[PDB]
Design a protein around this nucleic acid. Structure first.
Ligand SMILES: [Mg+2]
Ligand SMILES: [Mg+2]
Ligand SMILES: [Mg+2]
Ligand SMILES: [Mg+2]
Ligand SMILES: [Mg+2]
Ligand SMILES: [Mg+2]
Ligand SMILES: [Mg+2]
Ligand SMILES: [Mg+2]
Ligand SMILES: [Mg+2]
Ligand SMILES: [Mg+2]
Ligand SMILES: [Mg+2]
Ligand SMILES: [Mg+2]
Ligand SMILES: [Mg+2]
Ligand SMILES: [Mg+2]
Ligand SMILES: [Mg+2]
Ligand SMILES: [Mg+2]
Ligand SMILES: [Mg+2]
Ligand SMILES: [Mg+2]
Ligand SMILES: [Mg+2]
Ligand SMILES: [Mg+2]
Ligand SMILES: [Mg+2]
Ligand SMILES: [Mg+2]
Ligand SMILES: [Mg+2]
Ligand SMILES: [Mg+2]
Ligand SMILES: [Mg+2]
Ligand SMILES: [Mg+2]
Ligand SMILES: [Mg+2]
Ligand SMILES: [Mg+2]
Ligand SMILES: [Zn+2]
Lengths: 62, 91, 50, 69, 101
RNA sequence: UCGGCCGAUCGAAAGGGAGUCGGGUUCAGAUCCCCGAAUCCGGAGUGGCGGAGAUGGGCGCCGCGAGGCGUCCAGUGCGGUAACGCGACCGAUCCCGGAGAAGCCGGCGGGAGCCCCGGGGAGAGUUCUCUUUUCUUUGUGAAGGGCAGGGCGCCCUGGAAUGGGUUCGCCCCGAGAGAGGGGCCCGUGCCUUGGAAAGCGUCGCGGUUCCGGCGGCGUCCGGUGAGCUCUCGCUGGCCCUUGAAAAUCCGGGGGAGAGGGUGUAAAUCUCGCGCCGGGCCGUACCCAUAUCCGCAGCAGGUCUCCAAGGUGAACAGCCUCUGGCAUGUUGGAACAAUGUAGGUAAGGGAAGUCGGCAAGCCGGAUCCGUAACUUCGGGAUAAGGAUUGGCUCUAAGGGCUGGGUCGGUCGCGGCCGGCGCCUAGCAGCCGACUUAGAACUGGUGCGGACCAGGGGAAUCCGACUGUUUAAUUAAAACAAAGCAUCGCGA
RNA sequence: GGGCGAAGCCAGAGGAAACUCUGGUGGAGGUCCGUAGCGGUCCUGACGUGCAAAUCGGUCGUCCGACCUGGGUAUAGGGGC
């Protein structure tokens, strides 16, 4: 029951947090997810001919 | 962004050991951990394995060099001198 | 311990065998002068030599 | 254990000198013929039933034909 | 796509400690289909009796353990829980019998 | 003729070291007994059975052809461009190499076990009202075969700048990228033989004073993840530190030799199966607030493995499940002083005291905001300030598939094509947590327990981290890097 | 279990260059807070014919390193260390 409430956002707040924001959700893990999601999208765009090699390589570095 | 003004690689030592000792070890630690261009394969992969031992990852060539640099200025003049004396020795 | 040598195990075997009461018929012998086994040993009170 | 694939290999396996016994296990889906040799238990799996019944009468004589049901 | 579960009220009705008519009268308003009690979810779940056998036939995914949950709820309401006991006598079938001393 | 372990021997129940697992069984033993499945090493002299070696061409003849006879010549296997593969695949002394055989730390990824979620069963719990509810349970060993999956600094084609590929980070490439196609290793995962006959859960029926009794049914389908623990792998960092040895096993180089005259053949065989054997010693139990040491059933000491739910950053603290226990060598009745341990205290706030000793204040997280000084790294959580509950929402952060212009037709379906423009990207399905914002709301209470820095200005000493008088001194003492001096060419 | 965030790297901006600034990434250190462990500051607390011939309570120091620890070895008395 309490887990279902926490899905909707209850009991999260500011007075319910004891660990650091990085201890609760690490920045390195957040960066990995973002890199994996974005690099996957760029790859799928390259093999579907939406972008070429040169636009892919510019955006990969970006 | 540039993270430190002057300590660079010796920022790992904190406030310890003295500024001049950290400055002294700074240039040695930079050359100790640098990757040199291998003179056998041409790749920039010749890195220190142990003190005096320099190994290339590509051609797997191991060279005996200096403690902190790939070659010492002492040994370079010696190689030039030995070459000069050898060509003087024969005719 | 559980790991033991044969010589130690044989030593412990003899100590078990001689740690028993005297037979009741000993006291009926002529001129016995023995009341009880005075060399009885308990594992917790006194420890073995080894 | 070893799994015998086709029918013929099971016959000369059961006709070996070290074959102690053959067990027949009738499952819901198949019939298994397990002959106990010296090193391995050789199992032959028969999907249907007419071939399993045919194999039952074709077994070499003088060998234990223990049924597991 | 037909479930056809069965409830067997034989031993208690022959001892007269309860009647299958009332137990049938208990089920049709307590059975929930898609979370809604009453009207059997639009009549999709049907109910009938053989004077001892109460069978539940459904055309939607419907759990057998729900009948045991509902039957145990009836027995507690009628103070029969300390004598009777719902036991799965087979698949698609439940049967309530006495505690064996 | 060849032959250096160039040195006996001992030295590890945590190093090296072939090969046993599942089920049952006792009052007390089991990876040891029983049942069932394997496996390692050693042996087979009279050679145990197969298979391999290895059994083909040439010429004369006969023979309608096919096929038979004689003679001669081969034959210590074969396939793939390659990586390498196939069931064997002659070979000594000698030589070369490998494995054994290697630190610590970081970050990722694969696999398992556990945890979690959604259903289907079986049995229980609650039912005052509600709860399709809550709880329990819902197997497949070793060893083979096959297939996933992971890895490769392996091969072939080809030749790349408008450089490209690519990681969380990196890193890689004319010494051969990308791409296409292959090969190898690991395979603890899945399926299969083992295997359901066993085990387990339920519901029954008989009894052999104490049945591995008999029987019915079931042992199902999914989804998740920076989760935890093992394990496997990849890639880095650190070292004036470079993190054993030896038994033992294997591969290669070389070709001394051996084997037969064309035979149902030989030498030989790391291939399949079959036969025999594996001796000696240890093995119970405790392993600690009672089986050990401390004189004792002593609040001390004594090396390890496994490790659930909630909260939470968490192996914290607090509560709980499995498992365990009986409060630590006694109880009863009262509730004096003094004590030991723990709290509170109006007003004042160190006036107490050698001395703020002791206690108290602060404390988590978020958003701001941070001085002198400084070896420029720090100081720094400086200092200082605001907020924190509950409830109802709103945004944002992903993954999977499918996008056809159609009968011109028959393999209400399939091979090509006249047959069309998602190209500002849509449609459906599934899915974790996390952040931000808003409204409402309670006697302003909200890190509500637990967890959890008081701060600033200076002076002395020691640079720091480290160490020290076990049992009255942890310090400014010792050590330290740095600096300097001295001896020494064997 | 958290904090700080060294080198290396990416992007953007400013620069004639030299280079500089900003945002990320990365994860160093006889680094910090703090478990287990190791130690033993203060109460000059408890106890002081004790639980104990050195223990106990709270509070403490350190907690990736000159770290903690088992077993096997070596050094023996004017000697060892
Ligand atoms: Mg004792
Ligand atoms: Mg020895
Ligand atoms: Mg036992
Ligand atoms: Mg199985
Ligand atoms: Mg390539
Ligand atoms: Mg069964
Ligand atoms: Mg034992
Ligand atoms: Mg004790
Ligand atoms: Mg003693
Ligand atoms: Mg006691
Ligand atoms: Mg008490
Ligand atoms: Mg008591
Ligand atoms: Mg007061
Ligand atoms: Mg006051
Ligand atoms: Mg005063
Ligand atoms: Mg005074
Ligand atoms: Mg104080
Ligand atoms: Mg300050
Ligand atoms: Mg609010
Ligand atoms: Mg000091
Ligand atoms: Mg100083
Ligand atoms: Mg000490
Ligand atoms: Mg002392
Ligand atoms: Mg000085
Ligand atoms: Mg530290
Ligand atoms: Mg610290
Ligand atoms: Mg002291
Ligand atoms: Mg005292
Ligand atoms: Zn090189």
């Amino acid at each position: 029951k309490n887990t279902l409430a926490r899905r909707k956002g209850r009991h999260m707040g500011i007075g319910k947090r004891k660990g650091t924001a990085n201890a609760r959700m690490p920045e390195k893990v957040t960066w990995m997810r973002r890199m994996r999601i974005l690099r996957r999208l760029l790859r799928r765009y390259r093999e579907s001919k939406k972008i070429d090699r040169h636009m892919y390589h510019s955006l990969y570095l970006k | 962004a540039k993270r430190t003004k002057k300590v660079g690689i010796v920022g790992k030592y904190g406030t310890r050991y003295g500024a001049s000792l950290r400055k002294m070890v700074k240039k040695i630690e930079i050359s100790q951990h640098a990757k040199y261009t291998c003179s056998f394969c041409g790749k920039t992969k010749m890195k220190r394995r142990a003190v005096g031992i320099w190994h290339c990852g590509s051609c797997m060539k191991t060279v005996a060099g200096g403690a902190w640099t790939y070659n010492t200025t002492s040994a370079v003049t010696v190689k030039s001198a030995i070459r000069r004396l050898k060509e003087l020795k024969d005719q | 311990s559980s790991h033991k040598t044969f010589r130690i195990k044989r030593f412990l075997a003899k100590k078990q065998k001689q740690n028993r009461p005297i037979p009741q018929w000993i006291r009926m012998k002529t001129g016995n002068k023995i009341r009880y086994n005075s060399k009885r040993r308990h594992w917790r009170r006194t420890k073995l030599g080894l | 254990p070893r799994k015998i694939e086709e029918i013929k290999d099971f016959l000369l396996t059961a006709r070996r000198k070290d074959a102690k016994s053959v067990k027949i296990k009738k499952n819901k889906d198949n019939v298994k013929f397990k002959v106990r040799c010296s090193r391995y238990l050789y199992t032959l799996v028969i999907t249907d039933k007419e071939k399993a019944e045919k194999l039952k009468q074709s077994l070499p004589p003088g060998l234990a034909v223990k049924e597991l049901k | 796509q037909v479930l056809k579960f069965t409830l067997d009220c034989t031993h208690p009705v022959e001892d007269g400690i309860m009647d299958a008519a009332n137990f049938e009268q208990f089920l049709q308003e307590r059975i929930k289909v898609n979370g809604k009690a009453g009207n059997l979810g639009g009549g999709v779940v049907t109910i009938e009796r053989s004077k001892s056998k109460i069978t539940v036939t459904s055309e939607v995914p419907f759990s057998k353990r729900y009948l045991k949950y509902l039957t145990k709820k009836y027995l507690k309401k009628n103070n029969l829980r300390d004598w009777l006991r719902v036991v799965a006598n087979s698949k698609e079938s439940y049967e309530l019998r006495y505690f064996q001393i």
